[PDB]
Design a protein around this ligand. Sequence first.
Ligand code: BCL
Ligand code: BCL
Ligand code: BCL
Ligand SMILES: CC[C@H]1c2cc3[nH]c4c(c3C)C(=O)[C@H](C(=O)OC)c4c3nc(cc4[nH]c(cc(n2)[C@@H]1C)c(C(C)=O)c4C)[C@@H](C)[C@@H]3CCC(=O)OC/C=C(\C)CCC[C@H](C)CCC[C@H](C)CCCC(C)C
Ligand SMILES: COC(C)(C)C/C=C/C(C)=C/C=C/C(C)=C/C=C/C(C)=C/C=C\C=C(C)\C=C\C=C(/C)CC/C=C(\C)CCC=C(C)C
Ligand SMILES: CCCCCCCCCCCC[N+](C)(C)[O-]
Ligand SMILES: CCCCCCCCCCCC[N+](C)(C)[O-]
Ligand SMILES: [Cl-]
Ligand SMILES: [Fe+3]
Lengths: 281, 240, 301
Amino acid sequence: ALLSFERKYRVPGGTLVGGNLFDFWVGPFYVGFFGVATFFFAALGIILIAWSAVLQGTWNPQLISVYPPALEYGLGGAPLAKGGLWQIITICATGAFVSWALREVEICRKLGIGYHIPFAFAFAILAYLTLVLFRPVMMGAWGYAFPYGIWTHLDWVSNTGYTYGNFHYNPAHMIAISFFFTNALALALHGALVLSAANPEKGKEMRTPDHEDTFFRDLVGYSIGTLGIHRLGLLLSLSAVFFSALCMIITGTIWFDQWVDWWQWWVKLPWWANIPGGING
Amino acid sequence: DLASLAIYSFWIFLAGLIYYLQTENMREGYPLENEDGTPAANQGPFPLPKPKTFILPHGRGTLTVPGPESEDRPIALARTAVSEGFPHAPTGDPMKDGVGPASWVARRDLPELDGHGHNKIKPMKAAAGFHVSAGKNPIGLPVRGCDLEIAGKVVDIWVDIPEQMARFLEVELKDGSTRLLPMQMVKVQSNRVHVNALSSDLFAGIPTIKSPTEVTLLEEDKICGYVAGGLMYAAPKRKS
Amino acid sequence: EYQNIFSQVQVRGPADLGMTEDVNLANRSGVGPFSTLLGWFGNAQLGPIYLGSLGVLSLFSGLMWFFTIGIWFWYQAGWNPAVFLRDLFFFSLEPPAPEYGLSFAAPLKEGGLWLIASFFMFVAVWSWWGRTYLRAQALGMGKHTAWAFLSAIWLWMVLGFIRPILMGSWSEAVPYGIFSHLDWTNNFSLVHGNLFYNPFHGLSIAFLXGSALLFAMHGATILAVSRFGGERELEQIADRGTAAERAALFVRWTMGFNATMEGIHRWAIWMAVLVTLTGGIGILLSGTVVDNWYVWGQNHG
Ligand code: BCL
Ligand code: BCL
Ligand code: BCL
Ligand SMILES: CC[C@H]1c2cc3[nH]c4c(c3C)C(=O)[C@H](C(=O)OC)c4c3nc(cc4[nH]c(cc(n2)[C@@H]1C)c(C(C)=O)c4C)[C@@H](C)[C@@H]3CCC(=O)OC/C=C(\C)CCC[C@H](C)CCC[C@H](C)CCCC(C)C
Ligand SMILES: COC(C)(C)C/C=C/C(C)=C/C=C/C(C)=C/C=C/C(C)=C/C=C\C=C(C)\C=C\C=C(/C)CC/C=C(\C)CCC=C(C)C
Ligand SMILES: CCCCCCCCCCCC[N+](C)(C)[O-]
Ligand SMILES: CCCCCCCCCCCC[N+](C)(C)[O-]
Ligand SMILES: [Cl-]
Ligand SMILES: [Fe+3]
């Protein structure tokens, strides 16, 4: 079934691979070559997750976990039962993620729009690959990577984090946090502003961008505008993830001591390092 | 305990909230249709919402949604397969016909107004006080197609007055007529404006507007659409 | 292929004094300057801002809060500008000791100040809230910004006011300090038995991360369809055009469900406000009702 305005858009073409073979929809879903790949890597990856659950001895989803190899195996392979399944599943996860991004490109071409969405999505693939691929390789084992389980992946964050003290003190963590916070502020503001102009005081006509821009200027003296806000949101959230991967690529590779102590470079600056009083000395 | 209460209450409120959100996004394009335009049998899980009515400013009537959905235009397409789910090939020139990435929508054929009821977009030559403030001024530059051939010259910028941004390049063609080019679809360079989406032979094909100083919403969609369609359809004439 | 992340040309006209509606124009400033730097990303125009009684009141007490904290940072630094710049992150204005409970009888050097600056902040923020409501009312707009703002006020109120009063001591509240408010956070989690077991924490994280995903998509899409005039989120509601049609079709073809131009902004406002709404409940219940989220999690309830 089709949206009331949709038929005029379901034209042939735009594919990257395969020509007109997978150029079709199933229900609302566009397929394409990379729809097939997505479903392949996803179906294959799901099977191995259930296989991992057979060997583990549990079907409870709050207990299924698929752990990386032990540190002992370094960056080599390991038995299916002892870390190899995470290795296959991880390859599949990547396959499914990259085919998802690529399938989105194909959807974009048919529709004649910009590629901004898969581009944004590629930053999230970056983050995933930092955690399960770039950081482990540099550190020298797959063991440094996180496990595929609901609550156990949360134990990894707590344990990785707490290994360097309070992880709060990673300076890239701090920046990454800030962008994550500002994006939510900007999202609530954008959401509220559009709705407040389309949905005014009862009985009044719809407001105009004019009203939206006047509201911001009246409130903080500056209005970024309606194109600027989407520029801003795309950019805020893409930065958040970027500094996340960054705080995490430098941890255990070029900085492995405690993160609170890194700040001592500032305090030992020589022109005040030995001045007495304050908190330090 | 009290926290267990808290969290069930929340997961219930969260389930009604998603239901609300889901039905609010059914206010356009519904009910679903078969590819022949009759109503589909399977309309999905949630019902349609209680219609809402917007009051359009400036005495422009109302809009009530969900409302009756007619394309109000002709669709030049034919089926390619015997079963639902495949593409629909164009039966003419998709760029002229307005299908695929060249589609437009039958929007009001009036210009969007600002908060004061004046035309929101004016050619700069009629926008008092307006000038290029930063960046390269495109006015006067020649316009180049994706086939590396020259199609026209920029003779004005069409500007959003309340938002103070450039929105169209008014391009003059060889016969003396002009056309609007979406500003998002040109690359202004030191010695030219480059248009990746159109070869030069397709510039006269850009839809024209009916008044030299105003562009209407239909007009905006037809122009904009046609330019985007060249990305797919004018590809038999493009190099790097 | 130009991407629309920066403007290629900037146009300028007269400064925009703004819509009037029921606004008292005696309280709008002169238009500030025009930033060309800002003009590549958004609007070049700075000002005019609107200041009334609530504006001054908020801005006044907003500074009084800020100054109190920084006055105590100099006293901590022993007035040496060099010490100040060095230990700036390390200074901290702390709430009264537990001994003083909820009384205001605390000495200046041991709380009291924190209570002064806390009160000034409390006046500044609520002032500013009423300002967002009253600014919308003047333009005849909905009060969505003010209700959404209330959800951030929720968490803040819980962290330093509601939860301290419920615990019975001002000491439970957050201090004023860069590195010191970080430490309060870690600690809070440790004492209550790992906040990762607080289900409102894990939900509030879901919405955090989901707001980054949503604004990532919404922004990318509107840029992807600005060639059709999509950034014009509002007239596309009054009169759906092709920008709105293809933005809907991207998400239907990718992942199967529907998004209208207005409809997707309801997702935006709720995804965002749920971060602080859920989080506030999790911090409020922590230590009032629940001592140890691991132990609570063990009984699943
Ligand atoms: C005790 C734990 C430590 C700590 C240790 C860590 C550690 C350790 C890490 C972080 C990381 C992060 N932390 Mg920290 N952190 C702490 C305290 C905090 C506080 C806080 C209030 O105190 C906050 C707000 C944060 C915030 C953050 C972010 C900066 C960052 C997570 C986002 C991210 O990477 O997204 C990136 C997004 C992804 C990786 C997801 C990608 C999704 C993929 C591409 C697609 C998946 C599809 C899925 C399978 C689809 C399936 C469903 C359907 C079938 C379709 N931390 C404490 C002090 N923090 C992480 C980071 O920076 O990672 C790079 C990290 O590794
Ligand atoms: C990003 C930094 C850290 C990390 C730190 C945290 C912390 C801290 C928390 C979570 C939380 C969650 N994380 Mg984790 N998380 C990481 C990487 C991942 C990856 C991945 C890269 O593949 C995935 C799929 C998940 C998945 C999840 C969910 C179990 C949960 C809610 C996510 C959410 O709302 O997202 C935002 C996305 C949306 C709103 C869109 C919809 C996404 C749907 C719901 C995804 C479900 C995935 C499903 C359960 C598993 C995949 C299906 C497979 C076929 C098996 N995390 C890394 C290592 N994650 C929270 C939680 O409650 O966990 C118990 C939590 O507190
Ligand atoms: C080691 C530390 C603990 C931890 C302890 C805590 C504690 C403690 C808290 C959180 C909170 C949160 N944590 Mg946790 N958390 C950790 C691990 C994580 C990780 C992770 C490892 O990946 C992540 C992603 C998160 C994520 C989150 C957020 C979802 C949430 C804060 C929401 C927010 O927007 O606050 C930012 C917004 C505000 C605080 C509201 C501010 C509103 C006011 C009105 C602003 C006024 C500003 C004032 C006027 C100054 C203006 C100055 C200038 C004028 C500009 N936590 C570990 C487990 N976390 C909070 C929460 O809700 O928990 C449920 C919380 O209190
Ligand atoms: C970069 C900014 C933010 C962002 C953006 C973003 N995400 C996106 C997009 C964009 C722009 C999309 O276009 C795309 C999309 O379609 O969204 C609806 C997507 C998407 N973001 C998703 C999730 C997601 N995004 C996250 C984060 C973020 N996404 C960033 C914060 C997170 C977090 C914070 O943890 C998650 C979980 C999906 C909804 C979707 C991608 C769907 C996809 O790739 O589907 C193909 C794959 C499958 C259907 C399943 C494959 C299964 C595996 C082979 C087996 C499982 C392996 C996996 C490692 C198990 C892990 C689970 C445990 C860790 C619990
Ligand atoms: C340059 O030097 C000068 C002196 C000029 C200026 C410098 C100033 C400086 C150095 C400022 C630095 C400020 C900093 C570092 C601020 C940090 C603030 C942070 C991180 C705050 C975090 C959280 C705060 C919270 C949660 C506060 C909550 C408060 C309330 C909810 C209200 C509290 C109300 C109370 C206690 C009751 C008050 C009394 C009555 C009767 C209502
Ligand atoms: C988020 C803050 C945005 C910037 C706000 C500053 C702009 C204030 C402009 C007022 C200036 C008017 N004045 C006094 C110069 O005439
Ligand atoms: C929120 C602050 C963001 C402001 C961004 C300022 C970036 C300047 C970009 C200049 C590049 C424009 N140009 C044409 C020179 O390329
Ligand atoms: Cl910043
Ligand atoms: Fe703004």
